[PDB]
């Protein structure tokens, strides 16, 4: 293992070959999950891009966080998307937290602590256990077929995800930076492979 | 009974079948009342919707809180409405408190603690005792005949109503979240039935 505390991944150039692949000890299919992270880039105002690609052999888009220019954040699961609009975008590092549950189909999204209205999406579904998780490039196949126009340029870090919805109390604690015990992906005990031009550097954001 | 403290009702999908029905031990016709609540949705900028439907057999609109796009808040009593404008609408949870009195006909409305100018409406009237109270769907009949275009999507909670006007002191205390003793509807000792897809979840707002 490794500890990335106060460190982050940097993609400086637009390409279709640089990417970071993560590994998880997950064995059981998921019925509910949450994922939090922090990222910083300026392509927001030029073109869309992916943020966190969780793909399975049966689905290139099992879970996907995307940004669409003039649209906002697109949270997709099981090949279906939900949109959260953003009339205008600021230029600064942003921390987000998204959660989904199969039992009811409720979706929660949080940006900078402020929650967004809940929504319903793909009730009763299940998520495959074995999967490939990638940062930097969108997936249209099982770990391949990347698109340059869907790549990400900038910094990313503080990648974590549990396998059960968190109460608002807990989300606020995560933003404040208190202690926590991630279950599926631990930024403090993480495993990763890298390809292409990707660097590890001290984080910009506090 | 039940205690909903730190919990709220969620309607995730637009429909004409989901709704929550409340019950009150009220026996005497009302000569004055107040009602406060907290709610969160984003349909504000798309179409109007109801918030709290209190209907009687003789009147589908005995008491009604409505939002009209580009107009604002519409407080209706005895089938007649009064308007409070809002040039622009923010996107965040909102807490409101409205009061009416039959003796004089004065109306008070409070949003986020800031009071609005008083107005006169239906002086000398009385309100029927037996009634049906609904959250989620507007009423055009005694507990039926809902309209999809008048439904509500989002979260609602902290539903309470006395049967006498409250002094500004008291309204400020209610917003600060201090202790209080509701008379007609107690969020802490509430009774409710549910229909359709409605969920109970921890509240978003502080």
């Amino acid at each position, epitope marked *: 293992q490794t500890d990335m505390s106060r460190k982050a991944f940097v993609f400086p150039k637009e390409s279709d070959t640089s990417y970071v692949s993560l590994k998880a000890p997950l064995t059981k299919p998921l019925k509910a999950f949450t994922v939090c992270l922090h990222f910083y880039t300026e392509l927001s105002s030029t073109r*869309g891009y992916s943020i966190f690609s969780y793909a399975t052999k049966r689905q*290139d*888009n099992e879970i*996907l966080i*995307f940004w*669409s220019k*003039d*649209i906002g954040y*697109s949270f*997709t699961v099981g*090949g*279906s*998307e*939900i*949109l959260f*609009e953003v*009339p205008e975008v600021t230029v600064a590092p942003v921390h987000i937290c998204t959660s989904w549950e199969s039992a009811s189909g409720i979706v929660e999204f949080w940006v900078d602590g402020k929650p967004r209205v809940r929504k319903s999406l793909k009730k009763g579904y299940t998520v495959g256990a074995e999967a490939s998780i990638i940062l930097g490039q*969108e997936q*249209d196949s099982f770990g391949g077929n990347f698109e340059g126009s*869907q790549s990400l340029v900038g910094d990313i870090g503080n990648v974590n995800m549990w396998d059960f919805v968190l109460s608002p109390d807990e989300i606020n604690t995560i933003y404040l930076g208190g202690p926590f015990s991630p279950n599926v992906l631990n930024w403090r005990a993480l495993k990763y492979e890298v390809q292409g031009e990707v660097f590890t550097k001290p984080q910009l954001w506090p | 009974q039940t205690d909903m403290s730190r919990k709220a009702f969620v309607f995730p999908k*637009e429909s004409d079948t989901s709704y929550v029905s409340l019950k009150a031990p009220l026996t005497k016709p009302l000569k004055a009342f107040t009602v406060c609540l907290h709610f969160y949705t*984003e349909l504000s*900028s*798309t179409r109007g919707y109801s918030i709290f439907s209190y209907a009687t057999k003789r009147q589908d609109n005995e008491i009604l809180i409505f939002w009209s796009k580009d107009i604002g808040y519409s407080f209706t009593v005895g089938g007649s409405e009064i308007l409070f404008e809002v040039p622009e609408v923010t996107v965040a949870p909102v807490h409101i408190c409205t009061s009416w009195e039959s003796a004089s006909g004065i109306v008070e409305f409070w949003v986020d603690g800031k009071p609005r100018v008083r107005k006169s409406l239906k002086k000398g009237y009385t309100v029927g005792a037996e009634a049906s109270i609904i959250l989620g769907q507007e009423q055009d009949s005694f507990g039926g005949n809902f309209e999809g*275009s008048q439904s509500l999507v989002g979260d609602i909670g902290n539903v309470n109503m006395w049967d006498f006007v409250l002094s500004p002191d008291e309204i400020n205390t209610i917003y600060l979240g201090g202790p209080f003793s509701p008379n007609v509807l107690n969020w802490r000792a509430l009774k409710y039935e549910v229909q359709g897809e409605v969920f109970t979840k921890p509240q978003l707002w502080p």
Partner: nanobody, 115 residues
């Protein structure tokens, strides 16, 4: 599957306007709609689309000329083009948003704007 069905196209001269439309067999309360046109020889180019919230986006060329509208009540979207000109003539395709990789397409309708 979404049974998209568009209509409102044919033969028109330059300097006119047309209000085409399309409808779907499912609620459009959340998905966004758009339009693609394809000129003879080139690919499918975006023209305009409208989000579920109501925000609208228009292609640069047709900026200030076209206009899109939506109606949840009947599950139908509309596009009105004004001051039609011959170069805008092309095959117009319907759009149904889906996962970012994928998207539904309609049969498309030819609109030939002569002089």
């Amino acid at each position: 599957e979404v049974q998209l069905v568009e209509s409102g196209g044919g033969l028109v001269q330059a300097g006119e306007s047309l209000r085409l439309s399309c409808a779907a067999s499912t609620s459009i309360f959340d998905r966004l709609m758009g339009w693609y046109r394809q000129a003879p020889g080139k690919q499918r180019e975006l023209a305009a689309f409208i989000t579920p919230s109501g925000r609208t986006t228009y292609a640069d060329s047709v900026k200030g000329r076209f206009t899109i509208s939506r109606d949840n009540s009947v599950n139908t979207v509309y596009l009105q083009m004004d001051s039609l000109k011959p170069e805008d003539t092309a095959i117009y395709f319907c759009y149904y948003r889906l996962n970012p990789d994928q998207n539904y397409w309609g049969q498309g309708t030819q609109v030939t704007v002569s002089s």
